[PDB]
Amino acid sequence: VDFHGYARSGIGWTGSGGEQQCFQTTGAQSKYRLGNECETYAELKLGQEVWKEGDKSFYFDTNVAYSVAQQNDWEATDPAFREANVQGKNLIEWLPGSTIWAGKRFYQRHDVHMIDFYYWDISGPGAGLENIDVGFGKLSLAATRSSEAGGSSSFASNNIYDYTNETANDVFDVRLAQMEINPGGTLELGVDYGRANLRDNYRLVDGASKDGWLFTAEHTQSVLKGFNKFVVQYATDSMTSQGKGLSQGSGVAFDNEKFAYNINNNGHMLRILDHGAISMGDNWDMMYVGMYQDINWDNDNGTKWWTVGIRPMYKWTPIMSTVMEIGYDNVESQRTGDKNNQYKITLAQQWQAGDSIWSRPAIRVFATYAKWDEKWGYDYTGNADNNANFGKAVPADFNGGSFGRGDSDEWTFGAQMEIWW
Amino acid sequence: VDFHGYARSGIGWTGSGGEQQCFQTTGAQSKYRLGNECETYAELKLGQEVWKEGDKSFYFDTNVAYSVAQQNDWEATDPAFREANVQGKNLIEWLPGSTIWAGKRFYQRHDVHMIDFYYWDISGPGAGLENIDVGFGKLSLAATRSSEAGGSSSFASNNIYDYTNETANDVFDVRLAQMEINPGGTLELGVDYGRANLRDNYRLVDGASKDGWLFTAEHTQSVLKGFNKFVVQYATDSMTSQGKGLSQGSGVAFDNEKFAYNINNNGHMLRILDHGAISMGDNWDMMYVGMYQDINWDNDNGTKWWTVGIRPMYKWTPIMSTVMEIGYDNVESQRTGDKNNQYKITLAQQWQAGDSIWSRPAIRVFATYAKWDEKWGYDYTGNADNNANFGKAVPADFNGGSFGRGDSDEWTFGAQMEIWW
Amino acid sequence: VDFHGYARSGIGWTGSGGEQQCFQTTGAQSKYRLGNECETYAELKLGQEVWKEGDKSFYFDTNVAYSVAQQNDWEATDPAFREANVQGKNLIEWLPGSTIWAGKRFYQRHDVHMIDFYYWDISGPGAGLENIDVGFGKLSLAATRSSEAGGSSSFASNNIYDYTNETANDVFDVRLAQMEINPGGTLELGVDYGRANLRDNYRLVDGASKDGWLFTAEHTQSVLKGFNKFVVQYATDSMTSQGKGLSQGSGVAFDNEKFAYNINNNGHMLRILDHGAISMGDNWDMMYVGMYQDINWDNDNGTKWWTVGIRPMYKWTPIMSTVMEIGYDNVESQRTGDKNNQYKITLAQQWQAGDSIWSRPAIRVFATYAKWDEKWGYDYTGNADNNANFGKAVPADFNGGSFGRGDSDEWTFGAQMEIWW
Ligand SMILES: OC[C@H]1O[C@H](O[C@H]2[C@H](O)[C@@H](O)[C@@H](O[C@H]3[C@H](O)[C@@H](O)[C@@H](O[C@H]4[C@H](O)[C@@H](O)[C@@H](O[C@H]5[C@H](O)[C@@H](O)[C@@H](O)O[C@@H]5CO)O[C@@H]4CO)O[C@@H]3CO)O[C@@H]2CO)[C@H](O)[C@@H](O)[C@@H]1O
Ligand SMILES: OC[C@H]1O[C@H](O[C@H]2[C@H](O)[C@@H](O)[C@@H](O[C@H]3[C@H](O)[C@@H](O)[C@@H](O[C@H]4[C@H](O)[C@@H](O)[C@@H](O[C@H]5[C@H](O)[C@@H](O)[C@@H](O)O[C@@H]5CO)O[C@@H]4CO)O[C@@H]3CO)O[C@@H]2CO)[C@H](O)[C@@H](O)[C@@H]1O
Ligand SMILES: OC[C@H]1O[C@H](O[C@H]2[C@H](O)[C@@H](O)[C@@H](O[C@H]3[C@H](O)[C@@H](O)[C@@H](O[C@H]4[C@H](O)[C@@H](O)[C@@H](O[C@H]5[C@H](O)[C@@H](O)[C@@H](O)O[C@@H]5CO)O[C@@H]4CO)O[C@@H]3CO)O[C@@H]2CO)[C@H](O)[C@@H](O)[C@@H]1O
Ligand SMILES: [Mg+2]
């Protein structure tokens, strides 16, 4: 059996008191991870090539994820069964090197490790013909699925609370990669078309976005013994909320009291990303991100986000180093024009199983410091029924309340382990 | 470690709209599976022979099952811990070749693959001396356990709602197999005696069936490079409801509102089955079932069921074929004499890791069509308290209601993977 | 992948009726296990040495525990994710042979197998530098964590129900082992200091113990081809309730109706233990325990406990024996001076994968008999709100009630499997 996975687990403390806390800018879709992760998360994969004849084989892959809080030993939990697929390589003679897979699978996902942000991920139940050689590049085709909690009505109601039927959304993905636009550089182009797929006779809210498009262009350039990727994405409507390739065309959401509400996503998103890792010499490695994300919605509740951070690693020994991370977020409310921001500065001493910034296991002993100043937050007081600004951006002191994290500081510290295998 | 299991996962669509739907005749205990399974189901076994000395060994087996809906990636769930037993082979000198096992285990279960119907399965916590050589055949002995949700009273009440104590049932199984009644044919005979096993001082409802018997005779005939099994079973009372070897002698059931009710099972069941798989030549494989099940209860709510289906596979290549399934169900209400029926016709193009109809992995791309016409359904409207016909067969339009699936059509299609390893 | 674990699963019956029951003296923190365990419990570990260079390696270990009731096959459950750590051996040059680990881990726990009682176990999320060679012995250092359900107030309230915030507790452990105080004998000394660690601005109840100490001294003496351990421990305050190395400094507990209550643990505990296993000749093995535990609390609700039992095994064959266990408990209420006691006498015929009393797998067929007489129990009638003696020791007939198990008998029997691998 093949055994693979990922896991991070550790123990931390808050400078001001109690267990370790993690810091994330309100409105930001990520946080700088080093010395800023507060769960024990783990995926345990058990796969196995079950049949091979010459060039042909059938591979079987699975994945069961756990995520506990790490405040005790016995921590019962509901594991997510995330993957169970079969990939058949070289089964179509006239489409050599290509795979046909079906099942629940993590499909070609793209992410930025240091902020743990996945920008292109349509994983889920699915099927596809992957890696067809089109000569100048490799062409792939997949259809995956997701489904929103409610959003549909068995009959046409004018009352939003009548749209509580789960609504399946379908994504149809087409990618064209490994095109060498230049020397050292490759270009991948992708098109995603998602749409809410209603049961016969069901209806979505009026004005529900219903569908959308995600367009991706990733350029990878080999550099300094590392790489640099430059991404540019553009989403439309129903693809703006999840913003990674998955569709939410119903536009209905529910509060903790099962009350439906209208998170209308018509609009568009523009994402421009640049990240990579470069080795500069023998004693330094460093990863970096820079991103600007603009979710512009028709309802005016979008956000304009900017992040920048670097993680320079200096190797003392082939298995010991000093890692340092510095991140900065700044999110502006579309509805209110206010701005939230934060800068995190972490310093760690680690031991890796390798001389890379990419080598895992890694055992870290760190200290983190964050200082923020948020001038707006979301109004989640009340009920989707009691409240009418429920789920909206609102100023920090709106109606004499407290919204956002405030303007403060904090420092934490602890030991952690991280490993993909 | 040994790694074994089973898994099926896929993505589907409904001709009329939304995700794939599955079709099963109301009153039928199964449905024709090809292109008609709507969950991601998976069992992951991890066993290991932990000790061996010459002829003697101790094998340790486990099984953890998951079953998600496959409408998203992250799907939290409560896995069933189904097996954790130890089998000791050849530990009793004067009973050579025999095993002594104890633990929770799937014990010698018999099923009909294409309708995924298990007709002889007493699996559960248990213990037994398996495979004793009696000369003309192999004799096995096991005792397993199950327990119904409520059914017992701490004191004698006249009120059914007082019977909410879980009631353990015990099965005592004896099988005599591998007897060669003829050439190419073997005969297995089995006797199952189950009984509700009450705590000291507890009482079961009046008229509760309390116990029962299941009698099995299976004849396997080697044929056409395949086999054909002919089964005949007869159950009595408390063994009629589950009808596979497990006992439910309390006769109390609960509605979703915790209301007790009386699902009295005194009566008997007669099952006559014939299924198998035969290869006819080099280009065809085909499995088939034919069954007639008659659950006749004292309360008149039993059913008389008939199924027939065939799954012919024609091999284009050693690893590619066209599978087709055709199934027909027809269940008649004992209480009302009405009839529900359906015919499913599926057509699929698959790729297997083998030239057999039994070879897995298998990746299918299918289209299914079902057309039904049900004239009765069960009355599950209301409450075990509000309703008095609660849980009874009732005509399709009873009291101006709608019971049963109606008289309709539908077609679906999608891609799926199936694999046992 | 490395595959390890533990598992026990079986089927039992109660002499007087229904499934097997287990017997434990009210007030005792354990019971004699042989033929007296009523769950299917299982830990499945999957680890793997992920990197090795010469003397250096990184080992990755995990653990997922299940515990079902074993009254049916399909038994859904919430598995506990208990371990996910990385151990780096020999990574610190000038501290050779030593390990640095971080993650959630079962750390050097001590237990008495036959009563399944862990007397020194601080496992949980943690980190440490283990096995430093101090010359005369090996010195280890670890910090682990636990957290109580509530116990903290966001503001100073006088009302106990205001202390519902989870309160993290930290343990700081230091051990000094493998010191050879004599020939055949080793000495381990340990010091544990635990303390509730409050969020900035939170408050614990008044008089909450807040912290404490656990002091351990274990002497292992090689004897009769076995060992004998003699333990002496002394806890203080917040370490008295769990009494194994974990801290509970808040002193607030909750009833099943979320009502807070005061389980004040100021006081101390004195534990004097002696257990071991010795082989006496070729045909006998025998394990034994003897313990006296005195939890003396300021609130007068502590207990004074005494246990003694032996498990002599006589080998008929290298793989078959007759095991017998005899245990006696006697707990006296601190609050009421009354006494509860019981004696269990079990007799089993087993088959092991070895000629040891320590060899597993093991398949047992047993019969157990217990006879008790309890003169006090805890008052758990009512509510933390309705009741005021809620959670207190109370006489068997207090206020005309029934508290304690009474004065009775019972016998059970069944087959079971046990295995660590
Ligand atoms: O070798 C073929 C392989 O190559 C490439 O994979 C590499 C990635 O491109 C590269 O970025 C890197 O990926 C790492 C990732 O950086 C690292 O962080 C880790 O990812 C973890 C997250 O850290 C963890 O938080 C968790 O995230 C969850 C999240 O909590 C959950 O809410 C939801 O969003 O799902 C996430 C994922 O389940 O899990 C992820 C891992 O699942 O590990 C990544 C790799 O496993 O390194 C990769 C090689 O090691 C290609 O991208 C890939 O397609 C090729 O197959
Ligand atoms: O080699 C020794 C072995 O031989 C024989 O096993 C073979 C079977 O006789 C033969 O019929 C076939 O069995 C397959 C079965 O046909 C196939 O469908 C699959 O079974 C799955 C179901 O498909 C799946 O739905 C699921 O069913 C659950 C069900 O959802 C749940 O509600 C409840 O009813 O439990 C069921 C089972 O857990 O799971 C089953 C599998 O557990 O796989 C079967 C085999 O694993 O092929 C067998 C050999 O591959 C003997 O019968 C056997 O005793 C001998 O040990
Ligand atoms: O080889 C290096 C190893 O050596 C030593 O380990 C040995 C132990 O010292 C020795 O006593 C023995 O330990 C056994 C134990 O006797 C046996 O009972 C079993 O323990 C099970 C329990 O039986 C089982 O009930 C369960 O207990 C749970 C409990 O239900 C739960 O509520 C909570 O309290 O956690 C408990 C544990 O999770 O699980 C335990 C096992 O986890 O197995 C033990 C060993 O696995 O034999 C050991 C060697 O086989 C050192 O002590 C150890 O540090 C060294 O690493
Ligand atoms: Mg659960």
- DSSP codes joined into one string, A195-250: EEEPPTT-EEPTT---EEEEEEEEEEEEETTEEEEEEEEEEEETTTTT-SS----S
Measured distance CA(A405)–CA(A27) in Å, rounded: 11
* Ligand lying closest to the C-alpha of residue A109: 1
- Chain B hits for C71, Cβ within 8 Å: 125, 145-147, 166, 168
Q: How many residues does chain B have?
A: 421
B:C CB pairs within 8 Å: 136
- Interface list for B 354-413 with C (CB within 8 A): none
Q: Cβ of A11 under 8 Å from any chain C Cβ?
A: yes
- Chain A hits for B348, Cβ within 8 Å: none
- Chain B hits for C414, Cβ within 8 Å: 127
User: Are C387 and C253 within 8 A, CB to CB?
Assistant: no
Measured distance CA(B40)–CA(B416) in Å, rounded: 10
| Residue A155 main-chain phi, psi, to 5 deg | -145, 160
Contact C353 B51 (CB under 8 A): yes
Candidate from C111, C114, C140 with most ligand 3 atoms within 8 A of CB, to mutate: C111
| Residue C375 main-chain phi, psi, to 5 deg | -105, 15
- List CB-based neighbours of ion ligand 4 within 5 Å: A 78; B 78; C 78
* Ligand lying closest to the C-alpha of residue B227: 2
Burial annotation C83-97 (CB, 10 A radius, 16+ → b, else e): bbbbbbbbbbeeeee
Measured distance CA(A86)–CA(A80) in Å, rounded: 19
User: Helix/strand/coil (H, E, C) string of A244-259?
Assistant: CCCCCCCCEEECCCCC
Cβ contacts of A199 within 8 Å, gap of 6 or more:
A152, A165, B14, B16, B17, B18
User: Are A81 and A43 within 8 A, CB to CB?
Assistant: no
DSSP for A135-174, written as a single string:
SSSEEEEEEEEEEEEEEEESS--SSGGG--EEEEEEEEEE
Top residue of C2, C62, C81, C152 to mutate, by most chain A CBs within 10 Å, is C81
Contact C82 A66 (CB under 8 A): no
Q: Cβ of C39 under 8 Å from any chain B Cβ?
A: no
In the block, residue with structure tokens 């008495």: C112
User: Does the C-beta of C43 come closer than 6 Å to ligand 3?
Assistant: yes
Measured distance CA(C391)–CA(C399) in Å, rounded: 15
Q: Cβ of C127 under 8 Å from any chain B Cβ?
A: no
Measured distance CA(B395)–CA(B377) in Å, rounded: 6
Is the peptide bond between B361 and the residue preceding it cis, with omega within 30 degrees of 0?
A: yes
User: Are A277 and A285 within 8 A, CB to CB?
Assistant: yes
Amino acid residing at C41: Y
Q: Cβ of B1 under 8 Å from any chain A Cβ?
A: yes
C-alpha distances in Å from residue C134, one per residue of A84, B311, B350, C131: 50, 73, 66, 9
Neighbours of C, requiring at least 3 CB pairs below 8 Å, are A, B
Query: What was the resolution (in A) of this experimentally determined structure?
Result: 2.8
Measured distance CA(C399)–CA(C394) in Å, rounded: 9
Amino acid residing at B299: N
- Chain A hits for C81, Cβ within 8 Å: 40, 42, 66, 68, 75, 77, 79
Contact A71 C100 (CB under 8 A): no
Q: Which of B68, B78, B419 sits opposite A86 (nearest CB)?
A: B419
- How far does the CA of residue B302 sit from the closest CA of chain C (Å)? 25
The pairing of strands B211-223 and B185-197 is: antiparallel
Question: Which residue has its alpha carbon closest to ligand 2 atom 50?
Answer: B420
Q: In CATH, what number is assigned to the domain containing residue B414? A: 2.40.170.10
User: Does the C-beta of C420 come closer than 6 Å to ligand 3?
Assistant: yes
Q: Cβ of A10 under 8 Å from any chain C Cβ?
A: yes
- Give the residue ranges of DSSP H helices in B209-365: none
Please name every residue paired with B130 in a beta bridge, in sequence order, or none if there are none: B99
Measured distance CA(A233)–CA(C186) in Å, rounded: 66
Q: Pull the structure tokens for residue C259.
A: 């009502």
Q: Cβ of C1 under 8 Å from any chain A Cβ?
A: yes
Candidate from B31, B37, B111, B357 with most ligand 2 atoms within 8 A of CB, to mutate: B111
- Chain B hits for C354, Cβ within 8 Å: 51
Give CA A138 to chain center in angstroms: 25
Q: Pull the structure tokens for residue C14.
A: 């109660």
Side-chain half-sphere CA neighbours of B392 within 13 A: 17
Question: Which residue has its alpha carbon closest to ligand 2 atom 12?
Answer: B113
Amino acid residing at C9: S
In the block, residue with structure tokens 């994969």: A45
Q: Pull the structure tokens for residue A253.
A: 């959401």
User: Are C379 and C386 within 8 A, CB to CB?
Assistant: no
Neighbours of A, requiring at least 3 CB pairs below 8 Å, are B, C
Q: Cβ of A5 under 8 Å from any chain B Cβ?
A: no
* Ligand lying closest to the C-alpha of residue B65: 2
C-alpha distances in Å from residue B227, one per residue of B223, B272, B421, C326: 5, 17, 21, 55
Number of structural domains in chain A:
1
User: Are B244 and B122 within 8 A, CB to CB?
Assistant: yes
Q: Cβ of A125 under 8 Å from any chain B Cβ?
A: yes
Distance C24 CA to ligand 3 centre (A): 20
Contact C71 B46 (CB under 8 A): no
Q: How many residues does chain A have?
A: 421
- Chain C hits for B170, Cβ within 8 Å: 13
Distance A113 CA to ligand 1 centre (A): 7
Method: X-ray
- For A411, other C-beta atoms within 10 Å of its C-beta total 16
Element of type H or E holding C184: none
Nearest to C345 by CA among C366, C373, C315, C375: C366
Measured distance CA(B304)–CA(B302) in Å, rounded: 7
- Chain C hits for B46, Cβ within 8 Å: 3, 44
Measured distance CA(C191)–CA(C179) in Å, rounded: 16
Q: Which of B60, B102, B200 sits opposite C16 (nearest CB)?
A: B200
Nearest to A240 by CA among A263, A261, A217, A207: A263
Domain region containing A40:
1-421
C-alpha distances in Å from residue A383, one per residue of A255, A336, A378: 7, 21, 13
* Ligand lying closest to the C-alpha of residue C287: 3
Region of A405 please: left (phi>0), alpha (psi -120 to 50) or beta. alpha
Please name every residue paired with B372 in a beta bridge, in sequence order, or none if there are none: B342, B408
